[PDB]
Amino acid sequence: PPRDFPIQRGCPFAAPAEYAALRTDDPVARVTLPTRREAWVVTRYDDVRELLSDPRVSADIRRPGFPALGEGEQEAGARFRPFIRTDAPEHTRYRRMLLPAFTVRRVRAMRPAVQARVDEILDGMLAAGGPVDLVSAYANAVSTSVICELLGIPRHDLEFFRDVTRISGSRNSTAEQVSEALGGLFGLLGGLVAERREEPRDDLISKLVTDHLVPGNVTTEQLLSTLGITINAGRETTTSMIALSTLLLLDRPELPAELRKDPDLMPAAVDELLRVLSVADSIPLRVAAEDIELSGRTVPADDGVIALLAGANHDPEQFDDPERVDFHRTDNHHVAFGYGVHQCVGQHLARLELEVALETLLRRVPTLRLAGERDQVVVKHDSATFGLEELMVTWHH
Numbered sequence: 001p002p003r004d005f006p007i008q009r010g011c012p013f014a015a016p017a018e019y020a021a022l023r024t025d026d027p028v029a030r031v032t033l034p035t036r037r038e039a040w041v042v043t044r045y046d047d048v049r050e051l052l053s054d055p056r057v058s059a060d061i062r063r064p065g066f067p068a069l070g071e072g073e074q075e076a077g078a079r080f081r082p083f084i085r086t087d088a089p090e091h092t093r094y095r096r097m098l099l100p101a102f103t104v105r106r107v108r109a110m111r112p113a114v115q116a117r118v119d120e121i122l123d124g125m126l127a128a129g130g131p132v133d134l135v136s137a138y139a140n141a142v143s144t145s146v147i148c149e150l151l152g153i154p155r156h157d158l159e160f161f162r163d164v165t166r167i168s169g170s171r172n173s174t175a176e177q178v179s180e181a182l183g184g185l186f187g188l189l190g191g192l193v194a195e196r197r198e199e200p201r202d203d204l205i206s207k208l209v210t211d212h213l214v215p216g217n218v219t220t221e222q223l224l225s226t227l228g229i230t231i232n233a234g235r236e237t238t239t240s241m242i243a244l245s246t247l248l249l250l251d252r253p254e255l256p257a258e259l260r261k262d263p264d265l266m267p268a269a270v271d272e273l274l275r276v277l278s279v280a281d282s283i284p285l286r287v288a289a290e291d292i293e294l295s296g297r298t299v300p301a302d303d304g305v306i307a308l309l310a311g312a313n314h315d316p317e318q319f320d321d322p323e324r325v326d327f328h329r330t331d332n333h334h335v336a337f338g339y340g341v342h343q344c345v346g347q348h349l350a351r352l353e354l355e356v357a358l359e360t361l362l363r364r365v366p367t368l369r370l371a372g373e374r375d376q377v378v379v380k381h382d383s384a385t386f387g388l389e390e391l392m393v394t395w396h397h
């Protein structure tokens, strides 16, 4: 019988053991999604790049072969799906709209603003003390806070409002109250959107409002939709990397020891931590417009395929000793942010966010240790991007 795709990984810090077999044996294996439908899954680095790189592959959720892992997920085509699940002139229309907002030069500038926000998060968290959940306390704190800097949301006036709404917005509580929260988040944005319309600053909203909304390229509804979309793409995952990356540093003290000895590696370490952890893994799902050949096998057309970044980012044909977190890796051409047209737009921020968030903690909370018992750590079992759900830490007062 075709194997059920989603595999619970035993080791948090690495790809599921099944993958190695998949690379060597089944490069293009057939699996059964939780919806009991079938799809193909690619585990090889070189194949993942050709597969995502190929223009014979589409990200349309409308295709009935789409590999949705959710029951009504595929029924997004009948409805209006987000732009990240489209291809053609549609996909490029929004993605290419917000690229100038995310360039390296733009991100290099927020380096001081991003630092200050992170330090503030540390002060309060440091002042209060007590064992606290890093995932809630820090990882998310930075994530949410950094998006405000990019988005243009006022910090003090808001942030608190905003921090909570996102949390409520996604979760398993108050089925009726979600409407209330999304209304808050959306109401907040609308005001900013409208406000920037008059006398706008250097934010994504400003860039979008005065570059596309004002000349009529996007309807106000449209601008709002994407703004919300990028928040989802950049929140759950970024916080997941900080919390998960942080456990690895705690589990192996040999590693942060290196960072302290050489603080220059930090940017390099952020990249290695991305490939070794490979939090996204199953995120990019695509369908074959016409048959595509990879390795020995070929996937028929109109069939759903999933590119496993975790399988790719651990492939030894690319990474010598891929299971060793070597901060000195000679060749880190990882795909943690995907490959191709749909490659992450926030990679630069995620990196600056990750570097600033991780460094500042090692420096500011050196004493930091894990308050909860190890082996008691809880890894999300219901997520798109693998991550921890609770982490408890303390430090010397």
Ligand code: HEM
Pocket (backbone or CB within 6 Å): 083, 084, 091, 095, 147, 230, 231, 233, 234, 235, 237, 238, 239, 241, 279, 280, 283, 284, 285, 336, 337, 338, 341, 342, 343, 344, 345, 346, 347, 349, 350
């Ligand atoms: C934890 C660090 C991150 C990782 C590992 C990551 C990973 C990815 C991956 C694998 C994709 C492609 C999914 C697909 O095939 O459709 C993607 C897309 C995207 N990411 Fe991220 N991401 C991260 C952080 C962020 C941040 C901080 C932002 C900004 C809020 C962001 C914004 C986006 C957007 C807008 C897309 C859609 C690109 C498109 O298809 O046009 N990401 N990301």
